[PDB]
Design a protein around this ligand. Structure first.
Ligand SMILES: *[C@@H]1O[C@H](CO)[C@@H](O[C@@H]2O[C@H](CO)[C@@H](O)[C@H](O)[C@H]2NC(C)=O)[C@H](O[C@@H]2O[C@@H](C)[C@@H](O)[C@@H](O)[C@@H]2O)[C@H]1NC(C)=O
Ligand SMILES: *[C@@H]1O[C@H](CO)[C@@H](O[C@@H]2O[C@H](CO)[C@@H](O)[C@H](O)[C@H]2NC(C)=O)[C@H](O[C@@H]2O[C@@H](C)[C@@H](O)[C@@H](O)[C@@H]2O)[C@H]1NC(C)=O
Ligand SMILES: [Co+2]
Ligand SMILES: [Co+2]
Ligand SMILES: [N+]
Ligand SMILES: [N+]
Ligand SMILES: [N+]
Lengths: 182, 183
């Protein structure tokens, strides 16, 4: 079986539980994850961004299949959402999609949950071990049937024209640790 | 008070207890610390090197002042040694010195403990927080009087001509975590 993902305290990361997802590297690159709109006058729609000032907002992982031990494991497709309320008309779940002002594929909100065909895989992410203590990266490469529209890639930070730290699909990966919220 | 140094399990690092001192970064940069000679036919004297293949050899920190709670704290001068036996006629304690064949100041064996003579400060190291989870660097800059011979600097890894991974004083710092050997 794939290895369990562990949190910063070495305990298994679990589905249905709030975690902060926080940069493993401190300083300029430090910060957890939150949401923000395009960055100009429009408030909506939202994408996933890095907050440089704090550990960000709580995130919950949801399993695709029934996972009886409730443990999140390496390189298994899963769903991701922020456990917060927002004022845009969309879910708080992550997906890969086009986002205005950003070339390429962005991690946005408005994601779906579960498998129900090709497009639902655009809401599936994998968590893989990275090269720092207790650290992981997000990777997009679903193992469920889908079209070839979105190429497989790691998730990393990209500074947009407003210097908002967007998460996008790209060759390199951002390293994160998981910190149980409570 | 300064914060405790913590080990990879988040427990305070203690004086007089064995730890492996292991690279925070995996892959090519991975491995703990051990000792090796100048790299040619001579076995002696020894310097501190990174073993790329495993967590290395056990290391013990010793306090310079009396530390009642026995906890190693950030930015406090301390002594470092390997808790191993060697076949060179020197102590297993770390110090900064010139080492045969290596340009600049190297972390070698043959160190002293405590504070008798200005030379003994060349065996004093500080552990400072680095920018990765549970990660730290060694910094040489003693807080006790000494000669101006050895400049303050961080400790990092340098591949010598044999590709032996020497620890030297330099601007950049190698990030390490501490793993209790009885774990
Ligand atoms: C998701 O966020 C919710 C909204 O913050 C959390 O529920 C809230 O938890 C508060 C304590 O942190 C408590 O005041 C509120 O009563 C509660 N609000 C509602 C509408 O339930 C929720 O936190 C979890 O669920 C509740 C029932 C408590 O057991 C918390 O300790 C749990 O963390 C967050 N997480 C989940 C998985 O829903
Ligand atoms: C320093 O290294 C010594 C030599 O390896 C350790 O002592 C040895 O520990 C062995 C168990 O790992 C035990 O078989 C040997 O009897 C013992 N050898 C001698 C000469 O004592 C020492 O380990 C600590 O002390 C011993 C007595 C046990 O209590 C161990 O559990 C301790 O870790 C190493 N550490 C120190 C602080 O001396
Ligand atoms: Co070895
Ligand atoms: Co005297
Ligand atoms: N916004
Ligand atoms: N040697
Ligand atoms: N001296």
């Amino acid at each position: 079986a794939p290895k369990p993902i562990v949190d910063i305290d070495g305990k298994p990361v679990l589905y249905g539980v709030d975690y902060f997802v926080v940069s493993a590297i401190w300083g300029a690159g430090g910060g957890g994850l939150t949401v923000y709109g395009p960055g100009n006058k429009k408030k909506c729609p939202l994408s996933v961004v890095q907050d440089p000032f704090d550990n960000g907002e709580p995130i919950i992982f949801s399993a695709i299949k029934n996972v009886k031990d409730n443990i999140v494991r390496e390189s298994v497709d899963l769903n991701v959402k922020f456990n917060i309320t927002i004022n845009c008309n969309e879910t708080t779940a992550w997906k890969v999609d086009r986002f205005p002002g950003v070339i390429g594929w962005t991690v946005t909100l408005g994601g779906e949950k579960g498998y129900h065909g090709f497009e639902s895989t655009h809401s599936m992410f994998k968590i893989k071990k990275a090269g720092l203590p207790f650290s992981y990266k997000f990777h997009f490469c679903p193992s469920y049937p889908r079209t070839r529209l979105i190429p497989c890639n790691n998730v990393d930070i990209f500074f947009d024209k407003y210097r908002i730290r967007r998460l996008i699909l790209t060759n390199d990966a951002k390293e994160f640790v998981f910190i149980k919220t409570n």
